[PDB]
Swiss-Prot record:
Effect of residue 20 to A: Decreases affinity for RNA binding. Does not affect The NEXT complex assembly. Impairs snRNA binding
Residues covered by region (ZCCHC8 binding): 32-42, 66-83
UniProt modification remark: This phosphorylation mediates YWHAE and YWHAZ interactions.
Result after altering residue 86 to R: Found in a patient with a form of spinal muscular atrophy; uncertain significance
Subunit details: Component of the nuclear exosome targeting (NEXT) complex composed of MTREX, ZCCHC8, and RBM7 that directs a subset of non-coding short-lived RNAs for exosomal degradation. Interacts with ZCCHC8 and SF3B2/SAP145. Binds to MTREX through ZCCHC8. Interacts with YWHAE and YWHAZ; these interactions are stress-dependent and RBM7 phosphorylation dependent; release RNA from the NEXT complex and may affect RNA targeting to the nuclear RNA exosomome for degradation.
Summary of the function given for this chain in its UniProt record: RNA-binding subunit of the trimeric nuclear exosome targeting (NEXT) complex, a complex that functions as an RNA exosome cofactor that directs a subset of non-coding short-lived RNAs for exosomal degradation. NEXT is involved in surveillance and turnover of aberrant transcripts and non-coding RNAs. Binds preferentially polyuridine sequences and associates with newly synthesized RNAs, including pre-mRNAs and short-lived exosome substrates such as promoter upstream transcripts (PROMPTs), enhancer RNAs (eRNAs), and 3'-extended products from small nuclear RNAs (snRNAs).
The name this protein goes by in its record: RNA-binding protein 7
Protein location: Nucleus, Nucleoplasm; Nucleus
Domain annotation RRM: ranges: 17-94
Tissue: Ubiquitous.
Shown segment, full-protein numbering: 4 to 94 of 266
Effect of residue 36 to E: Impaired interaction with ZCCHC8
Gene: RBM7
Record annotation: effect of changing residue 72 to A: Reduced interaction with ZCCHC8, and impaired interaction with SF3B2/SAP145
Length: 101
């Protein structure tokens, strides 16, 4: 018994060119992200969401250089921060019945 209240599909993504980041801090910003992912390799752009209260809902996105055989940040960071809440990187890598080549 690991989790009781969670969706029974293999992983989180909603994207094929964009990296999902969750567990984000309450005072987080694109600047805190661009600097954490500076270590994780080529970053193309960042994304911060903002609720009716102006909050990133504890999640974000980052655009990255087709890094599909595991995103390096899932290994580099995954459990680190500066305000209180450790960054959690999430991904899937598949929207195809089979590879091309």
């Amino acid at each position: 018994g690991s989790e009781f209240e969670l969706r029974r599909q293999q992983a989180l993504a909603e994207a094929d060119r964009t990296l999902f980041v969750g567990n984000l801090e309450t005072k987080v910003t694109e600047e805190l992200l661009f600097e954490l992912f500076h270590q994780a390799g080529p970053v193309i752009k960042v994304k911060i969401p903002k609720d009716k209260d102006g909050k990133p809902k504890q999640f974000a996105f980052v655009n990255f250089k087709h890094e599909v055989s595991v995103p390096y940040a899932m290994n580099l960071l995954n459990g680190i921060k500066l305000y209180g809440r450790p960054i959690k990187i999430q991904f899937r890598s598949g929207s195809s019945h089979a590879p091309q080549d």
